[PDB]
Amino acid sequence: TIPHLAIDPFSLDFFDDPYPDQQTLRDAGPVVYLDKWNVYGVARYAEVHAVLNDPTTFCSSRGVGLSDFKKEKPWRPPSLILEADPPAHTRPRAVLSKVLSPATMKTIRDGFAAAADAKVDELLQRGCIDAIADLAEAYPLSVFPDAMGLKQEGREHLLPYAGLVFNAFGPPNELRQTAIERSAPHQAYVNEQCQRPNLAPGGFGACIHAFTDTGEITPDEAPLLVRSLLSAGLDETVNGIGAAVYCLARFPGELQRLRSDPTLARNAFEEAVRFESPVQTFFRTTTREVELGGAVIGEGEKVLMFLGSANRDPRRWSDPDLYDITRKTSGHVGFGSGVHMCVGQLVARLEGEVMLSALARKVAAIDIDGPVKRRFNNTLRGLESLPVKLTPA
Ligand code: HEM
Ligand SMILES: COc1ccc(C(=O)O)cc1
Ligand SMILES: [Cl-]
Numbered sequence: 001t002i003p004h005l006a007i008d009p010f011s012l013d014f015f016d017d018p019y020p021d022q023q024t025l026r027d028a029g030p031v032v033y034l035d036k037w038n039v040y041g042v043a044r045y046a047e048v049h050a051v052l053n054d055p056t057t058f059c060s061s062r063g064v065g066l067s068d069f070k071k072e073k074p075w076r077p078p079s080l081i082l083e084a085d086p087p088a089h090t091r092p093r094a095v096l097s098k099v100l101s102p103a104t105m106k107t108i109r110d111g112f113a114a115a116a117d118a119k120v121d122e123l124l125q126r127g128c129i130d131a132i133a134d135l136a137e138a139y140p141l142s143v144f145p146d147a148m149g150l151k152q153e154g155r156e157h158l159l160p161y162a163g164l165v166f167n168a169f170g171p172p173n174e175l176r177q178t179a180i181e182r183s184a185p186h187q188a189y190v191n192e193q194c195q196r197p198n199l200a201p202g203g204f205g206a207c208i209h210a211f212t213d214t215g216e217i218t219p220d221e222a223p224l225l226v227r228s229l230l231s232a233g234l235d236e237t238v239n240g241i242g243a244a245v246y247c248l249a250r251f252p253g254e255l256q257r258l259r260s261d262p263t264l265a266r267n268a269f270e271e272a273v274r275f276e277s278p279v280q281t282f283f284r285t286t287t288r289e290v291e292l293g294g295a296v297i298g299e300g301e302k303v304l305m306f307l308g309s310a311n312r313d314p315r316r317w318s319d320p321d322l323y324d325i326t327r328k329t330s331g332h333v334g335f336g337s338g339v340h341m342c343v344g345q346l347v348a349r350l351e352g353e354v355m356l357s358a359l360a361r362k363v364a365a366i367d368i369d370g371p372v373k374r375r376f377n378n379t380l381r382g383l384e385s386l387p388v389k390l391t392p393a
């Protein structure tokens with residue numbers, strides 16, 4: 001009843017061009033079985049959405065990577081939020097929600113916007129730049145470590161650690177094993193910065209610690225919760241901004257619409273998140289036997305959700321392969337859905353909005369002018385190098 005496929009969704013060949021294989025995964029059936037890794041897969045929008053919104057059956061506390069925490073040891077102590085189910089999930093989630101709240105966005109918006117404007121003006125003086133290293137990476141590194149309240153020393157470990165986190169959700173292939181091997185210096189840096197004295201008062205990390213006074217988290221929970229914000233947030237946002245720049249270069253009509261109404265910047269970034277889905281995949285583990293789209297899945301089984309495929313499923317989206325900055329993007333699963341839906345989504349949207357606003361107001365054209373290179377990661381989709389020439393408005 002369940003079709004078995006040999007597609008490896010963690011192979012370099014798949015990362016290089018995943019979209020034909022994603023259609024094969026969708027059209028095979030609502031539920032497939034991937035023989036390469038012995039997991040179930042759901043690639044259509046309806047089942048991916050249903051699984052995300054059924055946390056008592058499709059749980060997160062046994063890991064959201066391939067590894068089942070009931071069978072194997074986690075490579076680092078489990079996240080208190082990502083790798084937890086309700087009710088244990090609830091109070092750490094509430095703390096991060098308040099630390100990254102709408103009210104908090106007011107305190108950082110002016111500096112985040114000012115840094116984006118300044119970066120675009122700096123890049124316009126150079127003309128020919130790498131939109132990853134010099135923009136998609138440089139901009140988040142210029143605002144987010146400061147807003148966390150990190151010291152200057154050691155920040156060279158931040159991008160390597162985020163790459164490791166997302167490679168470690170994958171299967172035990174070369175990308176994962178290379179990342180975890182000799183990763184101790186990255187872990188040691190990150191764990192040290194999670195201690196209260198190393199976090200600047202007023203920043204995100206210090207505010208997490210301040211919530212230990214309230215009873216929502218204990219002081220011994222706060223370092224692991226800070227760790228969540230040094231794990232998530234950097235690489236996915238880098239990849240989303242780089243994909244937006246790529247899209248505005250490949251779809252010049254959409255850059256022109258954005259230039260004509262810069263208030264479309266926020267939705268232009270949301271559409272980039274749907275289009276690219278920087279987080280391609282996550283797993284759940286079944287807590288009981290369950291029927292899903294006619295498929296009977298046993299207990300204790302890993303279920304792979306193709307978020308990127310769900311965001312391109314023609315059963316749900318018109319012209320899913322087009323970048324459309326006025327698309328009604330509500331309902332996309334690029335940030336997840338349900339109790340775990342990205343608690344950092346307002347920070348992500350702020351960074352993406354203000355960068356795309358700066359481009360909309362200052363740049364007349366974005367032309368690819370060098371070899372484009374893909375960045376390979378077991379969980380993240382994104383570019384390594386994007387040489388462009390920026391023409392000033
Ligand atoms: C475009 C950028 C981003 C994308 C595509 C993204 C994607 C996601 C997705 C798909 C989830 C759901 C995980 C699941 O269901 O298991 C998630 C959760 C989460 N994200 Fe993001 N994220 C982004 C930016 C950020 C930022 C900027 C931060 C921090 C400031 C962040 C921190 C988190 C955390 C802590 C969670 C766990 C929430 C929970 O389990 O309740 N992410 N993210
Ligand atoms: C969605 O990606 C992540 C990765 C790590 C964490 C965490 O370490 O809590 C949360 C979300
Ligand atoms: Cl760590």
Ligand SMILES: [Mg+2]
Pocket residue numbers: 150151152200
């Ligand atoms: Mg400082």
